[PDB]
Amino acid sequence: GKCRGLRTARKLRSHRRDQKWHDKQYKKAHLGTALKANPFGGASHAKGIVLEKVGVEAKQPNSAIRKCVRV
Amino acid sequence: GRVRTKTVKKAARVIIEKYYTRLGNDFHTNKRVCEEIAIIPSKKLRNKIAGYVTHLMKRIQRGPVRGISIKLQEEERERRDNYVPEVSALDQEIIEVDPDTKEMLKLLDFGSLSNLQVTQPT
Amino acid sequence: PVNYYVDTAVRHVLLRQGVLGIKVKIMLPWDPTGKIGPKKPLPDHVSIVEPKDEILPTTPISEQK
Amino acid sequence: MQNDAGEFVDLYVPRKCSASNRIIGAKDHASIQMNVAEVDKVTGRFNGQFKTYAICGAIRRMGESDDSILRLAKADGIVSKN
Amino acid sequence: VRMNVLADALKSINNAEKRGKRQVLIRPCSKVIVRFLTVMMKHGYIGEFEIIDDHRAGKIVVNLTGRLNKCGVISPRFDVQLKDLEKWQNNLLPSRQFGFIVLTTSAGIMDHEEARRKHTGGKILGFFF
Amino acid sequence: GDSKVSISFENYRKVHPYEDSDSSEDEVDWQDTRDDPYRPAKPVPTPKKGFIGKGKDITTKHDEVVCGRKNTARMENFAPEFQVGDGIGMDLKLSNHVFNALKQ
Amino acid sequence: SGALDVLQMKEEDVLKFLAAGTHLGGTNLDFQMEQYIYKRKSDGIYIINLKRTWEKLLLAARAIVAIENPADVSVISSRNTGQRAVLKFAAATGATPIAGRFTPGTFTNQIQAAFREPRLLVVTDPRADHQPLTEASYVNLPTIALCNTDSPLRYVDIAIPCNNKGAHSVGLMWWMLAREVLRMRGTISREHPWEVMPDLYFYRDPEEIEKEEQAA
Amino acid sequence: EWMPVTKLGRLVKDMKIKSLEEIYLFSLPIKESEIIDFFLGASLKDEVLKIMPVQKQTRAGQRTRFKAFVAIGDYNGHVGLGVKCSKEVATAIRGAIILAKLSIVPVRRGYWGNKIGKPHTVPCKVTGRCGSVLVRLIPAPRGTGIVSAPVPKKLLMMAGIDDCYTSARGCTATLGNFAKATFDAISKTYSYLTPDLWKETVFTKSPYQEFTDHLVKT
RNA sequence: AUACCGUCGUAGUUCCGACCAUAAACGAUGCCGACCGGCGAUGCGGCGGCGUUAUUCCCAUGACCCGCCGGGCAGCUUCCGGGAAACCAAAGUCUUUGGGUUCCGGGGGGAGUAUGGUUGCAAAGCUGAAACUUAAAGGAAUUGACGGAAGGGCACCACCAGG
RNA sequence: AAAGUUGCUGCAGUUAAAAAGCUCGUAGUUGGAUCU
């Protein structure tokens, strides 16, 4: 199981950070490519100029056309 | 076909279980005994539960019945129930013992028995 | 038995959209003397009287009365 | 069970097993409260007094109930020595 | 291999108590096991016991009563401040009325309540309730 | 109880001159009267303040008894294939989570 | 017996045990039975300590007599090898006997033709009568059983270690149990031997019934 | 009108048995719902925990029948839980009520801090496991209420515990497992041994033993 | 029909000396230690033995039979307790959570992919992402709509004998 | 915070994601009883 001695701190802390890099939400916060591939660049809002209008097709059981815009 | 329904069988078994004293192997007395016992509406029903009763006491003389249990059972099973032979096979004139059982007798401080006969396990 | 036990009653209620039929069938009891149901027992229901538990004989006794 | 005022504020105090001291449960339906008769010393007569033994469900399930009863009766002198 | 002879002994006592036994044999023995069972006994959980002195590490034969619920060891022996003693008895004990935590001080091997009385803290050894 | 063949205790009855003694002939009659529990409520408008009354006997809008009874009465108007029963004769207090599961 | 001289073993009863074959157990041996057995033979059959059997009879008699109403005890035997003995045990004591097949749910199912609530259970063979022991485990019945050397001691509260495979052994064990519960009840003097002679209780074995009918 | 079947029912019907604690003290099975209907009476309230419609597959196809989890409880007293699977939901609820009367069990109540007043909390932290659901009850200070999910909140109020910390583990979405698990814990309340209960038990005669002379007559 | 089937046939399969280091390399169960049920077989060693055979053995000695001990290989069974269950005397002693320690998993795909380092003659191996993508993917057990699965059994509104 | 879904308190690793193919081995971690 776990290393559970009294002089076992750096092994436990190294294990924590190493395995915490396998956490999806933590890695998404801290690898830093999820904030460099992010289109908004970590912004709540962005501002754009409309390039074209687009009709995106609906997904299978829902039948509609959704009105989107390429900005 | 001709198979007894549940009600005929059940009423006949109840008539067997209680008032067993007054019944008998003839049908017609069994035909007339139920009217003082059971308030049975139809006569065609009286005649069907009274036929199963005679058929069942024909089955009684073959021995015990797996459906009824009454502590009267006429007066014949009681007599063989308390049958006593004159001399018990238990009261044996000589009883066979094994030497380690003879040790059991020795250490159960009854070592002075005489009715035992001891043989080696040949 | 059905003839003197149930009381079939069919009525029509007239609502705004149409008609609904209502069928009430009340199985009366075997109330003998009673005027609630018919005295006649159900043709199958049989009642067996428990034995009046008589005195088991102990000694032959002749009592003059 | 017993507050500092002094009332024994509890619904009931359940009996305890005489073999392994466990609490006899409320829905411990394999529980046994068994009475074993006390005899007259000189005559061999049933006095009217008895000794009581409680067996829990678990010991009786393991089959160790008879051994528990025998050791209880032996320690209580219902069984002679040996 | 065998570390901690108090972990082995308390696990043996707990299992042989769970199976309803009247006596337990624990080997090896040790001064910390003797004092642990002593402070167990002073509180009326464990009752009598015996020390079979083989000339090697001897054995202890413990007479049990069914008054015990759980005897456990805390390994590693953490260092218990007196300011830390309530957050250990809120985590290991089942109540505020019964149960004890065995802790070792320079004043000896004792319980958490006697440690509170004597105002000293120590390392932890185990718990019993 | 319901067995076709029956056992009669006619022997053990001691005396019964007055079979129709006026004890069991209590005329139970509540259907056409206003003692019928199965009657419309003649609904009251909901107060704007959200509760009814003052003092300490305030029966509010969200009362568990009233809301449960209304949930059962709302359950009474389900589809015919749905089996309800007689939850009005006995007092039901059917909660919103239970009723929402059933309604769904 | 609480080491009472009145209650101790008698030489006639020793002879009865040795003639019956009650000491001669089975071949296999369950471990929880090891307390009642002394040793197996070069043959392979274990030998039962008869004084333990006697003491268990005394303890079972103390248990049965301790019930005020004699009809509370339900005394059961499903195997034919003891069906006849169990009947006269009722006639000896007043208990309610179960002979033949035991209807499952007799002790549990309250809406039942044969439903009854005992305060005790006496059983010939725990191997064969597995059902009433469990039904006792559902409804709080102390149980006395006549256990062999290879007998599961599940749900038995008094185990009487004896032979129960033979007919004579079963009959004699039931006989001394009935005799002892009557002696503790006080309807028979302990000094004078019981008039009911134990060859009454043995199995009849219908071919033996026939050859005894010609031998009349 | 009730007159019973069982010996315990006959003792309960007459004035021989004074409280339901006499039945619990000898762990006798309660085979008549009218015993609980008699002793507690109208003090039992009931809350339908859930009605889930299961569609059984038959030779006739697919048929809807409802399973009712119904918890009854005498506040500051007793608690029980019952499940029924029946065609119509009012009958399912009443059948679940009947089974929940026979499932009734006493709860032990203790104190968190100083033993002052009437007991309010579970005497010690207990745990109850039913099919991947673990419910742990922790003693809690006076006035804190029941910190728990709605299901064990209902069960613990109807059991009569005024205050309790509660911690659950598992797939607690299944309300059956969760309800039966907290029921397991509140049965383990008296299934536990505390140093309050260390005194040697005097054995009182069983009601069958005490009143066997009255039971002979009927 | 290019799978399918039968006929030949190279490297290979074999040995010797170096690389390669991967497998469903599986008990799908890290290693070391403690406690915790029963049974009756097996292997090895040891101990205690009525008796049986080396043509009766002249002493020891091998081979059967009854046990006991230790360490194994496995089976049967249990309401020891676990567990989602299948099942497990460990997968038990786990909310009553702490004997020591090592490795390793974090919804499913992309993906054991690209890139980089390193080993390798090579094929490859070890380490090993992300962008983007979906609300499931999965595990145990329970029934059966349906068999294109097989049996019976029924009926002058079916048949045989006929009218 | 809920997340005991980052687990020191306090997760998991037969079948759901997972025990290195196996053994040796250094640093590390851990380590029988014994003295007032």
Task: Supply the key terms.
part of a larger assembly, 8 chains, F: 104 residues, alpha+beta, two-stranded antiparallel ribbon, G: two-stranded antiparallel ribbon, RNA-binding, ribosome, ubiquitylation, riok3, Small ribosomal subunit protein uS12
What would your notes on this structure say?
The structure is cut from a larger assembly and holds 8 protein chains of 8 kinds. With 65 residues, chain C is mostly beta strands. Helix content of chain C is 6%, strand content 25%. Chain C contains 1 helix and 3 strands, in the order αβββ. The two termini of chain C are 51 Å apart. Chain D has 82 residues and is of the alpha+beta class. Chain D has a single domain, classed as Ribosomal protein S21 (Hypothetical Cytosolic Protein, Chain: A, 2-Layer Sandwich), CATH 3.30.1230.20. Helices cover 21% and strands 22% of the residues of chain D. In chain D, strands 1-2 form a two-stranded antiparallel ribbon. Chain E contains 4 helices and 8 strands; from the N terminus they run H-E-H-E-E-E-E-H-E-E-H-E. Chain E has 2 domains: 68 residues, 2-Layer Sandwich (Ribosomal Protein S8, Chain: A, domain 1); 61 residues, Dna Ligase, domain 1. By secondary structure, chain F is of the alpha+beta class. Chain F contains 2 helices and 3 strands. In chain F, strands 2-3 form a two-stranded antiparallel sheet. In chain F, strand 2 and strand 3 form a beta hairpin. In chain F, helix 1 runs parallel beside helix 2. Chain F starts with a strand and ends with a helix. Chains in contact: A-E, B-C, B-F, B-G, C-F, D-E, D-G, D-H, E-H, F-H, G-H. Chains G and H meet through loops of G and helix 8 of H. Strand 1 of chain B pairs antiparallel with strand 3 of chain C. Chain E binds 2 RNA strands through helix 1.
Helix and strand layout, with pairings?
The structure is cut from a larger assembly and holds 8 protein chains of 8 kinds.
Chain A lengths: L8 H12 L3 H7 L21 E6 L7 E6 L1
Antiparallel strand pairs in A: 1-2
Chain C lengths: L1 H4 L3 E6 L4 E6 L21 E4 L16
Chain G lengths: L10 H10 L16 E4 L5 E3 L1 H16 L7 E5 L2 H14 L2 E4 L20 E4 L6 H10 L3 E5 L10 E4 L5 H19 L20 H9 L2
Helix pairs in contact in G: 2-5, 3-5
Chain E binds 2 RNA strands through helix 1.
Organism (chain B): Homo sapiens
GO molecular function, one term (chain B): RNA binding
Subunit structure (chain B): Component of the small ribosomal subunit. Part of the small subunit (SSU) processome, composed of more than 70 proteins and the RNA chaperone small nucleolar RNA (snoRNA) U3.
